[PDB]
Amino acid sequence: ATMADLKMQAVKEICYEVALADFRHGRAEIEALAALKMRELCRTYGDAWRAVARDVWDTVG
Amino acid sequence: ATMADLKMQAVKEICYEVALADFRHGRAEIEALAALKMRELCRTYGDAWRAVARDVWDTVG
Amino acid sequence: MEKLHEANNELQKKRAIIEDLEPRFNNSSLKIEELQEALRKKEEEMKQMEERYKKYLEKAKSVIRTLDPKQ
Amino acid sequence: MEKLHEANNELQKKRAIIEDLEPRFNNSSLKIEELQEALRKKEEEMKQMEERYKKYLEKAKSVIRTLDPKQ
């Protein structure tokens, strides 16, 4: 449960979603879907989404 | 790590080799990657390959 | 003088031909160039479309490379 | 014959025109049908290129769907 893999999971779980939505999502959408993914993951097990959403954009165009 | 674990991993990892290779792989090419994968999973961890290739092809063919 | 009306008859027959051919050719010279521009315009449809699918199938391949199952 | 040498001089001039145009038009009925064939071939190769691109797209999403990380 290191943050580096909570982040890594949100990265994976965002990419998946944007692809199966036919890369419909743009950046602001992704940054929002990064925070939400990040606040719901921390409530599973702050500035974490910035490095998540960046890693997301840096792999979906 | 039961047999379903080995099969389901085999499919996920052949569906990845089949994908990054630009979907150059056909059925017999795929029937033989699963005996590779299955065998090398019972060596790291019989007829399972047959159901693995059918699960793969279903998804890539 | 028989030749004279013979030659006038042949005269007017042969200009009915060149008064038929000039617009028949002129209009085709439109058709060929018409057909020629649709080819160029069709070859651009392929570029844009092929280039549209190449784009999202890298993103797909990228998304596939991120969920590497060997993790 | 004044008039005959005349019409005949015009007659020589008008079949040297046909003999110039009839090929310039014949080979052009041809070009019409080479461009039409090429247009249909291209219209096909895009129909299939597209269907080839749509299918790899679904083959990508399916491999994506298997690689669900939540599973």
Author numbering:
A (entry chain A), B (entry chain B): 742 to 786, 793 to 808
C (entry chain C), D (entry chain D): 552 to 622
Question: What does the paper behind this entry write?
Answer:
Hook microtubule tethering protein 3 (Hook3), a cargo adaptor protein that serves as a crucial scaffold protein linking cargo to microtubule motors, plays a pivotal role in regulating bidirectional early endosome trafficking, managing directional movement, and maintaining Golgi morphology. KIF1C, a kinesin-3 family member with plus-end-directed motility, mediates the anterograde (plus-end-directed) transport of vesicles containing several components, such as α5β1 integrin, 14-3-3, and protein tyrosine phosphatase non-receptor type 21 (PTPN21). A previous study showed that KIF1C exists as an autoinhibited homodimer, and becomes activated by interacting with the carboxyl-terminal region of Hook3 or the FERM domain of PTPN21.
In this complex, residues 553–618 of Hook3, which constitute the parallel coiled coil, consist of two distinct types of heptad repeats. As shown in Fig. EV2B, the coiled-coil conformation of Hook3 is maintained by an elaborate network of hydrophobic interactions. This homodimeric Hook3 coiled-coil acts as a scaffold for complex formation with two KIF1C(714–809) molecules, in which residues 742–786 and 793–807 are visible in our complex crystal structure. The protein folding of KIF1C(714–809) is sustained by intensive intramolecular hydrophobic interactions between the residues constituting the three α-helices, which include Lys748, Val752, Ile755, and Val759 from α1; Phe764 from the α1–α2 loop; Ile771, Ala775, Ala776, and Met779 from α2; Trp796, Val799, Ala800, Val803, Trp804, and Val807 from α3. Specifically, the main Hook3-binding interface of KIF1C is constituted by Lys753, Tyr757, Ala760, and Leu761 from α1; Asp763 and Phe764 from the α1–α2 loop, which are associated with Tyr607, Lys610, Ala611, Val614, and Leu618 of one Hook3 molecule and Lys612, Ile615, Arg616, and Pro620 of another Hook3 protomer that coordinately form a large extended hydrophobic surface on the Hook3 homodimer.
